[PDB]
Amino acid sequence: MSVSAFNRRWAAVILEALTRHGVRHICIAPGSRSTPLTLAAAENSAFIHHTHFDERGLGHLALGLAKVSKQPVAVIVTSGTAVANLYPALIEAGLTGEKLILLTADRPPELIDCGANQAIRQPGMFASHPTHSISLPRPTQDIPARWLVSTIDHALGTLHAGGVHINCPFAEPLYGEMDDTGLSWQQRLGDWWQDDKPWLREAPRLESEKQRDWFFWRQKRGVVVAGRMSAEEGKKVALWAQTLGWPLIGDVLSQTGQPLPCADLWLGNAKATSELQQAQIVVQLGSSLTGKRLLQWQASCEPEEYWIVDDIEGRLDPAHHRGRRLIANIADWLELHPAEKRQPWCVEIPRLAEQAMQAVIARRDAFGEAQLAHRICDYLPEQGQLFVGNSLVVRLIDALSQLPAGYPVYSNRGASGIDGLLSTAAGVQRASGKPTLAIVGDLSALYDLNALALLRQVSAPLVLIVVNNNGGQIFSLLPTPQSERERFYLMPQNVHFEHAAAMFELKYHRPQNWQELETAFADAWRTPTTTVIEMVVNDTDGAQTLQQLLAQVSHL
Amino acid sequence: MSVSAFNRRWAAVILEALTRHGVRHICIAPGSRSTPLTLAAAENSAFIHHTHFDERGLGHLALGLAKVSKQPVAVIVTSGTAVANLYPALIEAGLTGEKLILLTADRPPELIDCGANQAIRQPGMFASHPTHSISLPRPTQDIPARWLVSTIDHALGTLHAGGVHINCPFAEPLYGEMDDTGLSWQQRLGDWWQDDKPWLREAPRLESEKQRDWFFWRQKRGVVVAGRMSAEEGKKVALWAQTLGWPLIGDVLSQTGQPLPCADLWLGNAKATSELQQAQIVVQLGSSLTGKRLLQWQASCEPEEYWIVDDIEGRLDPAHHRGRRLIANIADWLELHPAEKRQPWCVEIPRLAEQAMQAVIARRDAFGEAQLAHRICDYLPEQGQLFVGNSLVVRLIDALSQLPAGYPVYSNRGASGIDGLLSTAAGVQRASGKPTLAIVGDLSALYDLNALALLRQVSAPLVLIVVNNNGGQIFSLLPTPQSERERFYLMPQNVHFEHAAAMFELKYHRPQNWQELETAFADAWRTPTTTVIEMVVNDTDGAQTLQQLLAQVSHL
């Protein structure tokens, strides 16, 4: 009888099904059409509920939660442009693997394409970017609950990685007292309601087989390239490469400890590239490599075989080498393909990597962003985690710093968007509960400025450094044309962030030297709150310092 | 030979082609892959260039420019999530007709689906929301320039309304001095380069035929409903309805002068609905009707025929009446279906509407958001324009105020998103150069907070009233459940906007009474800058006042 009650029973089946697939966090934005989903979620004690008013930030909050927790994270939004705002986080998850379950409320079919307020065409609106897309039908008791739970169980059970779009039409009325409408329909699932497993268990595993010629290849002159992986995987790859005697080029995202640091500099030296020409195999673990010199060496190298091991699917070599694309958990893969103790074969590169780091150390004193990046390993919070933003900061840390093995690093380096970094950092913090150091640029902080609202609730100290070099100074590193550079690339906004911090009652510091920065750090780590530290630096110093160091090391 | 030079020549054809279709404004966000487009645009003297760092706000800036100018407006963004951020504005334009030409830079095909940084699947990513989608090929001189301009000219020439997605792949190198690569290729267009017309002129017009039985139907008891239309159309509709002797129900978006004001209240009176039951025809001009009582009456009425006249395509009656859907410019349509003077047939409704307005005047004194809406006519800038935000404000002005005939009103009422109102207002102001009053709620201002950067550049005074009732109090008007209302619907953020204004060096006032508000306006209109006026009100007073007035008027 009651449409409002049955809507809520239909939604309750959806939300309960998700709990059987490890969904603990759910991120909710406000609306009316989403009422069946939101009330079902609110009443379900299995969830940790997060809220936000900007649906783009909400999606990135979920992305950060999923990024750290490695579990699917659910999102509820109302119909209309609220749904469209989820696209950035969904795209990023498609590239880096976070499992975002998007429950997007919709108008019913009779209110689409007829000029109805806040009604748009939602099925298929994210095109190929979700891993799975479910377009639910208009709720009716004539479709059994077992169909509804089975379709959700199929999508979640077979989800290797990436987002699921579940479009959820509901017709009005949405409000009213709940009666027993739909209760007997739910009860057809029997004691599934008291169970802890899916209704339909469908969870095939996707994994490459053991490489039967690994004992042959591990005796060749190999190179190990370490991209984005877990903190524990970084430590395991470091030990494996060291045992093989193969040089390890470790990305900032790898947590390997970077035994040959400043690769972005020493890969610019022809003697290093000449030595690497002797490599017969390159084994890359992880992907989304950061530095320009590494991407160029990767594109130019011609080993007999190039292997990429990673748990994300599809091609990951943008240079299309002859070789292998091996889908596996990296730690499992190393156990299936163990190292053999062998004599290291590289002689020149260890020399160059040491000289390169010494060159950077020689320039450590200036109060600039390149120096902050180089020294950042000295400021990492104990038992904490680093969230590195995009543009210059990730490149400068990668090029100039040596991060410790196993120290967790998080980032959005699939599509490398500057649109969701503060809200992602908030989710990264909330997921692990660890003290967090987050570093972003000024345009990045402006882009996601209203996510400072989220950072009013952190469970451990979060230090947000905003490097303010007055524009996107990556475009002073790139060879952009000087005449159009300021207006059409750098886009300086000529702001500071003291008022943004004050708006959201967040502590703020603008340190003018290292002593004041260290004082700010010391105070910030003492309370479970977010502290904003604005480092104001001369626009082009960081880019020019990197260029100068590249040149210096290339001439060694 | 030079890929970078040919990239720019290819892009120059695209951008020059757009100038032949009335594109004057172009909105550019920063990036590297977009270099060929951005440099072609920068060099082209036809354009007015706008820049912004948030691509979601950039899309809405373009939306506002197109909304007022009634011209196509171009947008350039780089590849990746920058493109996804255009979705909200594109969706809104699909509903209300703005012609947004989205030039989205892309990686070339060889760098898609291979783990390349900032490379995603872009063709089709906006699904059915663009009116036209062009997926351009990898640039090559083996495709003649005449094909490229012809494809642009087909898309722009045949564009009745809505957005065009032009996906634009470019391979590196993107930078370098331009040599003569591609010059002879461009010169195959001959003196088109000095022409002011398209290469291919394809501009079929879409229009319904005049209704030959109008002279029969105009003799019947009709009702005129006026939705969103131009300011001049509003004046023409008002005169036409008065001549017909038909009651005119005029939306806040109609600029008819609302001769039967407070329809949202008096439509709740059974004497009014009983009288309207005599109507044999309803002629609605414009669409996106605002008020709940009007939407409910429209849904319930049963005239023999229901007509909707508007220049936007497709069904516009969410109640699916038997009748006619006539695609036309409203002013042209009225010339083809003229009024002849006839005695008015309604006697009770004019009395009720006056009584309803009297009931509102009786409550004008309290310093609340309902009263601000009721009195907003008193604060409209001379020779200016109003941009009305979404949620309570548009509903309160519609229900409680009588806006002047022909005074321009602008809004985002297709999907009614709260995600782009400040950036849209910025474009509305820049397009016409008029002094602008923009009114939004607090969650709305937070959602698009960084668009305050744009409001640092307006060509005439813009007053941005932020009504701060601490949350989305539309959910105190809707019958949301009390237990979950605050956390999962209202979502109060407990902020003020004084620091936001200071961050962007915008004048700010927080008036405490009507006298201070009038003083604030007197100050604000003096200079071509944006003033933020924050009106702090008690959470639920606006919603309850509307509810009380509805009840009072229903009993007259």
Ligand SMILES: Cc1ncc(C[n+]2c([C@@H](O)CCC(=O)O)sc(CCOP(=O)(O)OP(=O)(O)O)c2C)c(N)n1
């Ligand atoms: C949503 C979106 N839209 C536009 C872009 C283009 N884009 C970039 C990509 O080119 C580089 C990404 C990367 O690979 O790291 S970096 C950048 C400027 C950032 O300015 P900043 O925060 O002040 O930092 P700084 O440059 O160090 O001073 C832009 C605007 C984007 N990525 N995402």
Ligand SMILES: Cc1ncc(C[n+]2c([C@@H](O)CCC(=O)O)sc(CCOP(=O)(O)OP(=O)(O)O)c2C)c(N)n1
């Ligand atoms: C992008 C997006 N996401 C969520 C919503 C849902 N939504 C609304 C639809 O009801 C507004 C359509 C309409 O006006 O008809 S109104 C609203 C709260 C606005 O709060 P406010 O600014 O403080 O104003 P107040 O309520 O007057 O206090 C929300 C959250 C949306 N529309 N767009």
Ligand SMILES: [Mn+2]
């Ligand atoms: Mn910057």
Ligand SMILES: [Mn+2]
């Ligand atoms: Mn509000």
